[PDB]
Amino acid sequence: MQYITGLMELLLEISPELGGHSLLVTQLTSRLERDFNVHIDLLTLMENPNPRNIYAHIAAQ
Amino acid sequence: EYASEMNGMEIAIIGMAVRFPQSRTLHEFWHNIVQGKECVTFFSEEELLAEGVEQSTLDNPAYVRAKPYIEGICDFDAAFFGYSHKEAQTLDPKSRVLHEVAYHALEDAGYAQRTSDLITGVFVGASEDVDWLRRSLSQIGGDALNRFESGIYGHKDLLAHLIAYSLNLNGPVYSLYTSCSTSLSATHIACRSLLFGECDLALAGGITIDLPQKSGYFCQQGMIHSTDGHCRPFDSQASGTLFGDGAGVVVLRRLEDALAAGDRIYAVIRGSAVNNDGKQKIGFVAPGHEGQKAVICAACHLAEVSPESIGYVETHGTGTRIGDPIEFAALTEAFDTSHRQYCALGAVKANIGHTHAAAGVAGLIKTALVLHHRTIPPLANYQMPNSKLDLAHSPFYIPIQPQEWPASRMPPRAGVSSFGIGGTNVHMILEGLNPAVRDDHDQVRAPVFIPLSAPSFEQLDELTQQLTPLLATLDASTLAYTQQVARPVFDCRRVIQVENDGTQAMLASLDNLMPDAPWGLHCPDLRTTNDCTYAQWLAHSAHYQREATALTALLDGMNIPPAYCHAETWAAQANSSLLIRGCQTIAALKTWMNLLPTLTLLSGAGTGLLPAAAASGMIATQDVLHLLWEMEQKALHLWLPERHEPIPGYVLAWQGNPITDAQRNDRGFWSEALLADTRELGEGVHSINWVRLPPEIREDVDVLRYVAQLWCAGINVDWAVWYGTPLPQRGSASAYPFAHNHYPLPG
Amino acid sequence: EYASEMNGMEIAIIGMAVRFPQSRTLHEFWHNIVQGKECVTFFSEEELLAEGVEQSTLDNPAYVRAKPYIEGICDFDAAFFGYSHKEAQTLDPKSRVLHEVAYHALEDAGYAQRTSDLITGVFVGASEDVDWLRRSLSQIGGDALNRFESGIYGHKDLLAHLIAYSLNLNGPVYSLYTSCSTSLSATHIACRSLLFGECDLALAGGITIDLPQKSGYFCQQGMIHSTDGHCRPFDSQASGTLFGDGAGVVVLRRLEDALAAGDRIYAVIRGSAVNNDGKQKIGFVAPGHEGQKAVICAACHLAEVSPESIGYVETHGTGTRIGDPIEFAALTEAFDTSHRQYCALGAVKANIGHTHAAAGVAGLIKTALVLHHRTIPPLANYQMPNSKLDLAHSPFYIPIQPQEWPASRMPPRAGVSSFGIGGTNVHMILEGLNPAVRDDHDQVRAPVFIPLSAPSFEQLDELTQQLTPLLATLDASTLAYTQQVARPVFDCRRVIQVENDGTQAMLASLDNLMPDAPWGLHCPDLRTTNDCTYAQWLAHSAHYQREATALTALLDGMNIPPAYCHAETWAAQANSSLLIRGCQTIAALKTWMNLLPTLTLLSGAGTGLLPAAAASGMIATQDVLHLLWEMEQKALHLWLPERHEPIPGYVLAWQGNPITDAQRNDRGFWSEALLADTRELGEGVHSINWVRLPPEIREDVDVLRYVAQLWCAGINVDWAVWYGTPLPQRGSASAYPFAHNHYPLPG
């Protein structure tokens, strides 16, 4: 989750569900998460609009 | 007949032409819609390695191999439009396709080569993809004159000026682009600038061709490209969409004019709304919800149709798992009704794949055909509905089998839609046209004839090979009429005769004719031969009774015959009066020279020389109509007329001796010429081809067969003159046979 | 007024903005027109070498070194428009300029941030060269998603959708191209779409940027380009054409709306025609003649203007050796009038050079400014006329020194032409507007107050450096009214006082202020004082008189003595009674509630507690009036009315202690607080900043000086409820300062 916030703060650069949520943002998050120790699916990629629900699916998998 | 209330603003659609994947004309487009067939194709490795694909991508699992492709993008008939070979070589393939599609969509409307007195004017709009841009600048150059030619010809936005220059069109012309809904934006501003009273015949359009044909795409997991090769809208199995190729052009004219001139109308466009979505959407690249329901309510309200009479809604339907409940939700909220399950749906993007900038006008041609043929076609690849939809408490049901249009919905109405990717939204309520009765009575009336034409023999063989499915689907009488009147003519000709059951017998040509010999008619002697100059059959011609009412307005004035006037029943007492016999001749020759423009001589062999001078222009009608009734008493002395100057052409002979200013000023020849020679071939030979009817003639169709044979011989004919009081309805006949060269793809 | 008839077809131009060469705003463009100097620059032998021209082309004698360049292609405001940094990096410089120019057009029309009630379209053309195409095709696009981003953002197809999305506009959008009159075809679509009732504003205008900004151009022999560097139109030494750069946007709205809302109008468009040349010429690149004469006669018919009262014709004026006799003969055959020389001529294409997509809108903006300022401007390079020009027999004469509008051609009427390359030929009769006249006589009127505002101190300082060139040209009262009302406000603020004759001086800061506090007002006891919470200075507000009329009507129903029921006469006999003083205080409190919307905590000590109550809404009005009446004569048996909860904003007090639900129902508390007297000046210590005037008031403008010293601090005071019954006209004012980053060009 920390690295996910690190790349979204790298891409958008605001220090404080209001992410990109568009063409490249979702795929760029989804690429390294499968390389990460977490396991993410494309179905929960298109179902989760917040890093809290993503982290909830992280604890489920 | 229209059968509703005419407000100020309606627009007809009087002819369309398409070239879509696995669909080369209109008849195959309706045959592909009705059956529910899909038009995507699947390649294999061998026909892909010949097109130049690296082997390190086929083994990748991201290359799903399918693409809806145009057939024949690399051929063009260069010399017909006005180009030469290098100028036809340097053209972007968009323009080579759209020239031929726009000429077919003119010629299907009737107004082919007749727009030099109508202010027509194009509005097409075209997309762009980058591969031909990469292939066009790999040439060398030094900014020369040829480079400036390649700078305006190879542009993708001097398309509409090239079309309206090459077909001689003199009205407004634009080249719009609003993303993914190009054709419906162009059709909407064509309806506005048609309603202002600016142009008369507007043409919509839109074309996209992605140049490396026969190649797959690259699927992605976080996108909208379908990972199957298949596009399924409103389905529980759905994956994505499918980007293909296309073409397509309509022709739009106002309602009142296209009901006055009697044309073939498919639909009548009523209302049309446009609005951007704005910043209510999340970013830039996705449409919302409120814009969709606002445009549907605005276009339903602006055209005075309540939304509980619309039995067909062509959606957008791209086939994603996200866009489809959104579009069904907007289409439920905008229809504010509470009736249950009365309206169908559909999406052409199942059948052909998503065309990139012709998608709206693909929708428009499908809904126009639906209101014209009156069925409701199936939705293709539909098994079980999407789980987030509820069809029960909502007006829409998805058809699976082709149905007739249900009663208690008449007159039919249907509504198209096309929302772009970026915001511009269009919607357009259509209302169909109620067809005629077809009162031909299924009787055993007559064979009718069809005059094909093309400028060379191979194209003529193609055009006569075209005729079998066109006779199989259409009707034969209206096909023959709209091939007679509203199509052009060319050099090498042929006639095809159609009998009552469907047979095709080619029509035999003449045997003995000479090319330099002019044409002419023969008039008999009224004293002995009571038969007229072929006036036994020309009674039903509408021009002939107009000349009869013109002649009876002058005969009844001063001559005062013994109670024989008003031009009613000349078929009962034809053999008695010389006056009606001379009138007959005058009217018969008048019709027989307005029927054929290349008719000059009007000779005769006794008692017809004065009607011949009357209707050739040498003598005015007043003195000869004065003299004809006084010829009945035949007692007192003859009268020499004022001898007016005739019209150019129409010189007169007596026994095959056409002479001018020799015997037209004396009196001895005029007194000598009033005798009966009684010799049909009294001239021997004088090189004059004669309009002689065949000896074995009984029915009125034999004279029309003769008129067809003189059409085949090589002189133009005024066909509309023959037909009676109900002029048969115009319709759709036959495309043109283009002659393909080959032009290589650059690079 | 306007001073002619009004049919349905008027469209008013209510604001324009430009970025033409050497012309970075609008007042410099008019100065450059009326002098006659030309904006083309010349280079040396080294500034070309410094930016990527090798020496092997410099020595070529067929190389003319000139190009009318814009300055500031690169820069942009990054975070204003709702962008990131990378998204701002990946754009295309046409978009990176036309964002700024269209926002200056809305800021000049007045509707800067008030587009929340109207339906605003966009209709923007553009033109695409080949050099950025070779710069952007060969760069690494990336994966499919970055290619999607670069194809959606970085192209000339999504330009008008970006202007309509970054600002908040939700009307129709389009993006035309008709190849040299792109701007005037977009303006003509905007007229035809305003007149039906889709949109209520529009935009227009194109852009053209050729990316190596400082570089020469190859002269040659076949294609037309100038062989010298100068574009002389209609001259004996005419050589060619000069291709340049440009921008430009207007804003259009109907005439009935733009007079019944008070706006500023430059010139009003009366008629518009478009056709195409057709095939009625020789080549695709050569100009026709019948097309030009037909479009001029149709646009002089459709606008009901006879071509006798047209005083100034703005033509194309390309400047080649062939186009100028053709254009002049077309004009003198359309103006079929047989007078002698009366109408001037001109061309902007000598001042700036050919612009290639904005040449139509350069013509429209120059003709709008000439009708607004009424000065015929001279032709830019003109010594002796062309040899085959028949000047003295034709209606036109060509000026060489700027002269005033000739006083026998009123109201002024003009005419704009722009003919493309083989495409549409657009013409458009404009018509000027008779002015509004000041009622001063060079007198010592009053100081005014100008409220500048910008979001940080650097941008504020650059904005306040604009008041010297604006005040040297305009007049100093409409500038102050436009800056007060029809412009937005921001955080860091400053006001500038302008006296009768120059002498700008910043208003002093306001001291002794404690932040995060409520603002309150106090009205003392009315038995002694006469200043009824400053109701003598507010007597000219024309909002004070509305409440005075309402209270006059309310006291007319019940009050016993006359001459107290007459409005406009309270101040004569106010000093004798108490009822008049209470009636004045009610309206003064409501006007000071209007002025200063964020005033919250009222108060009142002694008898003033009752008008403070009636203004707040706690008691009543009529009960308060007659209660004050028995306190005028009797002051026995007070009848306390039952209280309310006044307004969801305001809080009432007694001395400085807010009674927030303290007692509200005790008769002893009101009687003790009210019945004896107060006689304190009061207000020892609490935490609310009182609205107290400085004690040296001696005029009527001094309260305006105090309310501007309030607006220099945080109070968002309305700037319109102070001015009297003729409100001043709106007019034009300063334009925003943009914060400039730097984005380099990917060569």
Query: Which chain C residue shows the shortest CA-CA distance from B155?
Result: C128
DSSP state of C641: P
Please list every residue in chain A whose beta carbon sits closer than 8 Å to the beta carbon of residue C84.
12-13
The residues pairing with C20 across neighbouring beta strands, listed in sequence order, are: C23
Distances (CA, A) of B92 to B97, B135, B155, B178, C36: 9, 11, 8, 21, 44
The answer to whether B121 contacts C423, with C-beta atoms less than 8 Å apart, is: no
Chains B and C form CB pairs within 8 A to the count of 130
CB contact under 8 A, B321 and A21: no
Q: By what technique were these coordinates determined?
A: cryo-EM
3-state SS of B369-385?
A: HHHHHCEECCCCCCCCC
Instruction: Quote the tokens at residue B534.
Output: 């072929």
Q: Which residues in chain B have Cβ-Cβ distances shorter than 8 Å to A23?
A: 222-223, 285
- Choose the closest CB to C148 out of A12, A13, A23: A23
Whole-angstrom distance, CA of residue C617 vs CA of residue C623:
12
Q: Is B496 exposed, middle or buried (0-12, 13-18, 19+ CB in 10 A)?
A: middle
The residue of A22, A26, A40 whose CB has the most chain B CBs within 10 angstroms, and thus the best one to mutate to test that interface, is: A22
What is the least distance, in Å, from the CA of C89 to any CA of chain B?
Answer: 17
State how far the Cα of A35 lies from the Cα of A29, in Å rounded to an integer: 11
**Backbone torsions φ then ψ of C424, nearest 5 degrees:** -70, 145
Report yes or no: B223 and B334 within 8 Å, Cβ to Cβ: no
- Rg of chain A over all Cα atoms, to the nearest angstrom: 11
Give the pair of three-digit tokens for residue B292: 């969709």
d(CA B515, CA B537): 29
The nearest alpha carbon in chain B to C218 belongs to B143
Q: Which residues pair with B343 in a beta bridge?
A: B396
Tokens in use for A38?
A: 């977490």
Q: Cis peptide before C68, with omega less than 30 degrees from 0?
A: no
Which residues of B168-324 form beta strands (DSSP E)? Answer: 202-203, 251-252, 267-269, 273-275
SS3 C96: helix
Please give the CATH superfamily to which domain B11-432 belongs.
Thiolase/Chalcone synthase (3.40.47.10)
Helix (H, G, I), strand (E, B) or coil at C75: coil
Residue of B99, B188, B316, B356 with catalytic role: B316
Question: Left if phi > 0, otherwise alpha if psi is -120 to 50, otherwise beta: which for C552?
Answer: alpha
- CATH number for the region C11-429 comes to 3.40.47.10
- Residue whose entry in the numeric block shows the structure tokens 């006008």: B361
Domain boundaries, chain B: 11-432, 448-507, 519-692
Residues 6+ apart with CB under 8 A from B629: B555, B559, B561, B579
Distance from CA of B168 to the nearest CA of C (A): 5
Name the resolution in angstroms: 3.9
Q: How many CB atoms lie within 10 A of CB B424?
A: 29
Q: Which of C176, C275, C421 sits opposite B175 (nearest CB)?
A: C176
> CB–CB of C130 and B151 under 8 A?
yes
Q: Is C457 helix (H, G, I), strand (E, B) or coil?
A: helix
Burial of B409 (0-12, 13-18, 19+ CB in 10 A): middle
Rounded CA-CA distance C351/C298 in Å is 30
Selecting from B222, B283, B321 the residue whose C-beta is nearest the C-beta of A26 gives B222
Instruction: Give the position of tokens 């927030």.
Output: C660
CA angle C89, C95, C98 (to 5 degrees): 130
Is there a catalytic annotation at residue B540? Answer: no
Cα B238 to its chain centre, rounded Å, is 40
Q: Which residues contact A4 (CB under 8 A, 6 or more apart)?
A: A29, A33, A51, A54
User: Do residues C622 and C559 touch, judged by C-beta distance below 8 A?
Assistant: no
> Using CA atoms, how far apart are residues C625 and C605, in angstroms rounded to an integer?
18
Q: Do A22 and B222 touch (CB under 8 A)?
A: no
Out of 3.40.50, 1.10.10, 2.60.120, 3.40.366, the CATH code matching C519-696 is 3.40.366
Nearest CB to C149: which of A12, A13, A23?
Answer: A23
Q: Does residue B648 have a cis peptide bond before it, meaning omega lies within 30 degrees of 0?
A: no
**Residues 6 or more apart whose Cβ sits within 8 Å of residue C682:** C522, C605, C655, C656
> Distance (Å) from the C-alpha of residue A23 to the closest C-alpha of chain C?
6
Q: Using CA atoms of B558, B560, B566, B568 in order, give the dihedral in degrees to the nearest 10.
A: -140
Q: Which among B145, B173, B178 has the least Cβ separation from residue C175?
A: B178
Tell me if B193 and C192 make a contact (CB, 8 A cut-off).
yes
CA dihedral of residues B308, B313, B316, B319 (deg, nearest 10): 110
Q: How far C323 CA lies from chain B's nearest CA (Å)?
A: 19
Query: By a Cβ cutoff of 8 Å, what residues of chain A touch chain B?
Result: 20-23, 26-27, 30, 42, 45-46
Catalytic residue at C161? no
Among residues C405, C400, C425, C437, the alpha carbon closest in space to that of C309 is found at C405
3-state DSSP assignment of residue C609: helix
d(CA C90, CA C86): 6
Contacts of A13 in chain C (CB under 8 A): 84-85
User: Which residues of B are less than 8 Å from C165 in CB distance?
Assistant: 276, 278-279, 284, 423
Tokens (6 digits) for C413: 């009427």
The number of CA neighbours under 13 Å toward the Cβ of C217 is: 22
Search chain B and give the residue with CA nearest C180: B158
Q: Is C343 a known active-site residue?
A: no
Rg (CA), chain B: 33
In degrees to the nearest 10, what's the CA dihedral of C487, C488, C489, C490?
-130
Q: In chain A, which residues have their Cβ closer than 8 Å to the Cβ of B222?
A: 23, 26-27, 30, 42, 45
- Asked if B164 lies within 8 A of C130 by C-beta distance, the reply is no
Chains with ≥3 CB–CB distances under 8 Å to A: B, C
Query: How far is residue B723's CA from residue B718's CA, in Å, rounded to a whole number?
Result: 11
CA-nearest of C86, C73, C74, C77 to C150 is C86
Buried b / exposed e along C528-562 (16+ C-beta atoms within 10 A):
eeebbbbbbbbbebebbbebbeebbeebeeeeeee
Contact B285 A27 (CB under 8 A): no
- Find residue B454's DSSP bridge partners: B492
What's the angle, vertex CA B546, arms to CA B545 and CA B551, rounded to 5? Answer: 90
Task: Find chain B residues with C-beta within 8 A of C175's C-beta.
Answer: 176-178
| B314 dihedral zone (left: phi>0; alpha: psi -120 to 50; beta) | beta
**Coil, strand, or helix at residue C38?**
coil
Quote the CA–CA distance of B511 and B322 in Å, as a whole number: 73
- Residue B95: count other Cβ atoms within 10 Å of its Cβ: 22
The pairs formed by C672-677 with CB atoms below 8 angstroms and a separation of 24 or more are C673/C609, C674/C606, C674/C607, C674/C609, C674/C610, C675/C638, C677/C525, C677/C527, C677/C606
Beta-strand relationship, B11-12 and B267-269: antiparallel
Residue of B nearest to A30 (CA): B222
Contact A26 B220 (CB under 8 A): no
B204, B252 Cβ separation under 8 angstroms? yes
- Tell me how far apart the alpha carbons of residues C274 and C299 are, in angstroms, rounded to a whole number: 9
What do you get for the CA distance between the two ends of chain A, in Å? 14
- In degrees, rounded to 5, the angle at the alpha carbon of residue B658 between the alpha carbons of residues B656 and B660 is 160
CA–CA separation, B67 and B607 (whole Å)? 78
- Give the angle subtended at the CA of B303 by the CAs of B301 and B307, to the nearest 5°: 55
Q: Kindly give the interhelix angle for B578-594 and B621-633, rounded to the nearest 10 degrees.
A: 150
**What is the identity of the amino acid at C660?**
T
Neighbours of C257 (CB within 10 A): 15
Label each residue of B419-481 as H, E or C: ECCCCCEEEEEEEECCCCCCCCCCCCCCCEEECCEECCHHHHHHHHHCHHHHHHHCCHHHHHH
Contacts of A42 in chain B (CB under 8 A): 221-222
Cα angle at B577 between B576 and B580, to 5 degrees?
Answer: 125
CATH number assigned to the domain with residue range B519-692, chosen from the 4 options 2.60.120, 2.70.98, 1.10.132, 3.40.366: 3.40.366
B501: Cβ–Cβ under 8 A, 6 or more apart, which residues? none
d(CA C458, CA C462): 6
